[PDB]
Write a protein that binds this ligand. Sequence first.
Ligand SMILES: CC(=O)SCCNC(=O)CCNC(=O)[C@H](O)C(C)(C)COP(=O)(O)OP(=O)(O)OC[C@H]1O[C@@H](n2cnc3c(N)ncnc32)[C@H](O)[C@@H]1OP(=O)(O)O
Ligand SMILES: [Mg+2]
Length: 327
Amino acid sequence: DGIAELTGARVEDLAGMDVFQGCPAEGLVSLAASVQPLRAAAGQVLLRQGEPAVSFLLISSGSAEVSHVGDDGVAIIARALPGMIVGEIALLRDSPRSATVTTIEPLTGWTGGRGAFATMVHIPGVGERLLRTARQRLAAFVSPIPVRLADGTQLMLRPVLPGDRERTVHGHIQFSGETLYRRFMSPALMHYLSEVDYVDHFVWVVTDGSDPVADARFVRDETDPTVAEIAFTVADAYQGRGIGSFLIGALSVAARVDGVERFAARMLSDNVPMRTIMDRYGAVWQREDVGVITTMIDVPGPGELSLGREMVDQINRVARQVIEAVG
Ligand SMILES: CC(=O)SCCNC(=O)CCNC(=O)[C@H](O)C(C)(C)COP(=O)(O)OP(=O)(O)OC[C@H]1O[C@@H](n2cnc3c(N)ncnc32)[C@H](O)[C@@H]1OP(=O)(O)O
Ligand SMILES: [Mg+2]
């Protein structure tokens, strides 16, 4: 009859989504209180590149184009699908929206702020599922680059994907999810952000027959954003084939996209292959205690790397895809 009703999200609608099915009821009651219903026609702009990222979208039905336009006018375009989160990385990093999001067909879902996202990823089972969805979001448009070493070895170069162990297994640089991302804030949230972040921690992985044989990464300095520390690891049997030499090149291409101007490196003074790699870039060595040496080099500009132009363009394409387009 004349009874009062809720105006917000309904648990019944949220619970219909596969990601929440079976979750504790109280978790959904809290979430329902935190998000708002969204219904969009086709061809409608939901989010605009460069704007404040005040919300994320969770898509219940329909799909959208996600288009990042570079200052060079080059458009880098992904697709957001039902069950997918959109806009959440810029939301969590409090940075301008990375891409314009336009529906390709009628769309429905929910919107929410940073607190709603936190509430959502705290629900048991949900954070892990959403990370799998974030993985799928990347893997849908980012493909590995086949490369061949001078000895003929056939490998693939790809960014780490969300959930991959190479994200969290690094022994060379002192840093973690909580230390790197604390400035932006909750374990579940920090984990999620660390797994989906290509801006402050960028990791390349090299595989042989789908098995990782090497990785390299840079970690952005908290005090000077134009500087990152670098690290490399190549499986023993694969060493001395030029992979490390290749990776510092790949890492430089990604750093340029990420606005990293300079790399810091530390190692033992006797690590000959690693010193040699840095020597090629004009390293000036400073001595520290306990057999350690350090250096700082400029990230080589375009044309400066010994990699072919075609190789550089392929790596640049992927780096832009993972940094710029997809969150
Ligand atoms: C900043 C840091 O990350 S420090 C930590 C580095 N990681 C480690 O020490 C873990 C174990 N070692 C590794 O993972 C790898 O060997 C790395 C990352 C050090 C080097 O990567 P690799 O793929 O083995 O090296 P790569 O084959 O590119 O060779 C690098 C250079 O060292 C040279 N080199 C390798 N071995 C020798 C040698 N025995 N004598 C002289 N020069 C050598 C290579 O010729 C090459 O020089 P170049 O520019 O003339 O071509
Ligand atoms: Mg092989």
